[PDB]
Amino acid sequence: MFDFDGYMLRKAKSVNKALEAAVQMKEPLKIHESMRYSLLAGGKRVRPMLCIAACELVGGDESTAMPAACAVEMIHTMSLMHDDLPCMDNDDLRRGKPTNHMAFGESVAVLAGDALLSFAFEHVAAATKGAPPERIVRVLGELAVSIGSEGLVAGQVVDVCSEGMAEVGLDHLEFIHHHKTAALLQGSVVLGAILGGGKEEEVAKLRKFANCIGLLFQVVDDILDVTKSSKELGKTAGKDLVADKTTYPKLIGVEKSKEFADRLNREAQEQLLHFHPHRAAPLIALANYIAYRDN
């Protein structure tokens, strides 16, 4: 039997403890305080857990993947800090507290965000131990590609340039969700699998798996946005409706979105048949968590 609540509990604890050690208070104080305010506030740490679990699945250990795991959470964090700003979604709550720019000003929120992004690269490059240099370099490139113009940033810019697009298509919406959300999730699964010593074939199967849950994470985000309150979600919820935004609860409605999430999950766990079921248990569990979480 696999106790998923127990597993995530201790993986998240381990991750939160390393995030705190990696990003200490030091001069300039306000920049670092702002970095820690949003990073250590309190996310589910799905991305760093996926990175560690994929590393473990292929043979490696947590310690080798912890820096990359922390790095994906740093980049994920600054992407929410930047997403919340007035020129972007202009929100007032994130991770249960006022949004970064409300607490430090827009200037500091932008810069603190930029610091987390650069530091994620510094940190995986200099803190990773137990991997050949050529393997670290490779990981740095997968990370870079998963968050730039063919990844996270593209989905995010296409999202704000298609926020009034009344002529929405499944193809267009798929582009946004895959890039804006699935790309960083793929990257987290991929960095772990490569740092774990995985063979090309296992990496490719995990990339596909990650692609599914990646897309699934955004469908579920879109659904929560309309069925959960801001207090519950820890962030401003309900503004995706009032906006001409592109989501699934839009094109097919909540229910048809739910069924869709189910298939995605199903399809993701199917890619996992590549591995022995005892070993796949954690990723199978993270997959369900992504499907059935409440926030």
Which residues on adjacent β-strands are paired with residue 104? none
* Contact with ligand DST (CB under 6 A) among 140, 202, 235, 269: 235
91 marked as part of a ligand binding site: yes
Q: Does 46 bind ligand IPE (CB under 6 A)?
A: yes
- Compare residues 30 and 228 and give the one whose CB is closer to another protein: 30
240 marked as part of a ligand binding site: yes
Q: Does 80 bind ligand DST (CB under 6 A)?
A: yes
In the region spanning residues 95 to 134, those forming contacts with ligand IPE, defined by CB under 6 A, are: 95
For Mg ion, the binding residues (CB under 5 A) are 83, 89, 91
Q: Can you tell me the distance from the alpha carbon of 247 to that of 249, in angstroms, rounded to the nearest whole number?
A: 6
Q: Say if CB 217 and CB 79 are below 8 A apart.
A: no
Q: Say if CB 85 and CB 106 are below 8 A apart.
A: yes
5 marked as part of a ligand binding site: no
Q: Can you tell me the distance from the alpha carbon of 207 to that of 204, in angstroms, rounded to the nearest whole number?
A: 5
Q: Does 269 bind another protein (CB under 8 A)?
A: no
Taking CB within 5 to 8 Å according to partner kind, which of ligand DST, Mg ion, another protein, none is near residue 110?
Answer: another protein
- Helix locations, 128-247, DSSP H: 133-147, 152-161, 170-177, 183-195, 200-227, 230-233, 239-242
Least distance CB 66 / another protein (angstroms): 16
Q: How many CB atoms lie within 10 A of CB 152?
A: 22
**Piece in contact with ligand DST (CB under 6 A), picked from 18-26, 76-84, 111-119, 252-260:** 76-84
Q: Does 43 bind ligand IPE (CB under 6 A)?
A: yes
Q: What is the DSSP letter of 61?
A: -
Report the candidate in 156, 295, 160 with the shortest Cα–Cα distance to residue 230: 295
Q: Can you tell me the distance from the alpha carbon of 290 to that of 140, in angstroms, rounded to the nearest whole number?
A: 25
Burial 247-286 (b: 16+ CB within 10 A, else e): bbbbebeeeebbebbeebbebbbebbeebeeeebbbbbbb
Q: Does 73 bind ligand DST (CB under 6 A)?
A: no
In the region spanning residues 149 to 178, those forming contacts with another protein, defined by CB under 8 A, are: 149, 153-154, 156-158, 160-161, 175
In the region spanning residues 86 to 105, those forming contacts with ligand DST, defined by CB under 6 A, are: 89
Q: Does 264 bind ligand IPE (CB under 6 A)?
A: no
Q: Does 143 bind another protein (CB under 8 A)?
A: yes
Q: Which residues are annotated as a binding site?
A: 83-84, 89, 91, 159, 221, 225, 240
What is the contact surface with ligand IPE in residues (CB under 6 A)? Answer: 43-44, 46, 76, 80, 95, 180-181, 185, 213, 217-218, 221, 290
